[PDB]
Amino acid sequence: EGLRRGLSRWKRYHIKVHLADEALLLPLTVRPRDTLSDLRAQLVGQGVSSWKRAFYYNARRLDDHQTVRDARLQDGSVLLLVSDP
Amino acid sequence: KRYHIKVHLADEALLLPLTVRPRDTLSDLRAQLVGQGVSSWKRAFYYNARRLDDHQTVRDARLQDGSVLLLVSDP
Ligand SMILES: [Cl-]
């Protein structure tokens, strides 16, 4: 049932957010429960100007309330953070 | 002199290292990606989210060691 996922409560993904505008790769440690909003909040804590920027994975736009699990991210996954004028 | 850059293939979500010379054109980088099986037809390079011209050199695009380019498929 949920035994497997139960025994992995402390699972952390080490991912990368490619900030397109800065051509920078920011590493984030994230939980599969985290929403992209949590990721945005982490990035804001690093001074990333998040206003009017969206996440893309496999070149498709992600809704801010998807989770790291729903986005099917894993260790090493690279997200793209894209400005919209 | 060689730079070690990365190309972020947006569709595949992969980060491909390339070794390039400052005088390499982006057309040369494309041929490297094609040699690695990257389906490059109608994909363009972006840096700082500005579309790049294939005739531009690594040097003139102001790339350096560790620069991350972005390869994006066209409309
Ligand atoms: Cl040459």
Numbering used by the authors:
A (entry chain A): 2 to 86
B (entry chain B): 12 to 86
Task: Show the paper's wording.
The TINCR (Terminal differentiation-Induced Non-Coding RNA) gene is selectively expressed in epithelium tissues and is involved in the control of human epidermal differentiation and wound healing. Despite its initial report as a long non-coding RNA, the TINCR locus codes for a highly conserved ubiquitin-like microprotein associated with keratinocyte differentiation. Altogether, these results demonstrate a role for TINCR as protein coding tumor suppressor gene recurrently lost in squamous cell carcinomas.
To best evaluate the impact of these alterations we analysed the structure of the TINCR protein. Structural characterization of TINCR at 2.12 Å resolution revealed a UBL fold domain composed of four β-strands forming one β-sheet (β1-4) and one α-helix (α2), the lack of a characteristic C-terminal di-Glycine motif required for covalent protein conjugation that is present in all other ubiquitin-like proteins described so far with the exception of UBL5, and a 15-residue long highly conserved positively charged N-terminal extension (herein referred to as “cap”) as the most prominent features. The “cap” is visible only in protomer A, as it is buttressed by two neighboring TINCR protomers. However, its high B-factor values suggest that it is highly mobile in solution. Finally, the TINCR crystal structure stands out for the presence of a distinct basic N-terminal “cap”, whose highly positive charge suggests a potential role as a recognition module for either phospholipids, negatively-charged regions of proteins, or nucleic acids. However, unlike most ubiquitin-like factors, the TINCR protein lacks a characteristic C-terminal di-glycine motif7 (valine glycine motif in UFM1) required for protein conjugation. The absence of this sequence in TINCR points to a specific role and suggests that this ubiquitin-like factor may not function as a substrate for lysine protein conjugation. Projection of TINCR amino acid variants identified in SCC samples on this structure revealed a protein disruptive effect of these non-conservative amino acid substitutions (p.Arg5Trp; p.Gly7Lys; p.Val18Met; p.Thr30Ile; p.Ala42Thr; p.Val49Met). The distribution of these point mutations across both the N-terminal cap region and the ubiquitin-like domain, together with recurrent loss of translation-initiating codon mutations, N-terminal proximal truncating lesions, and locus deletions, all support a loss-of-function mechanism.
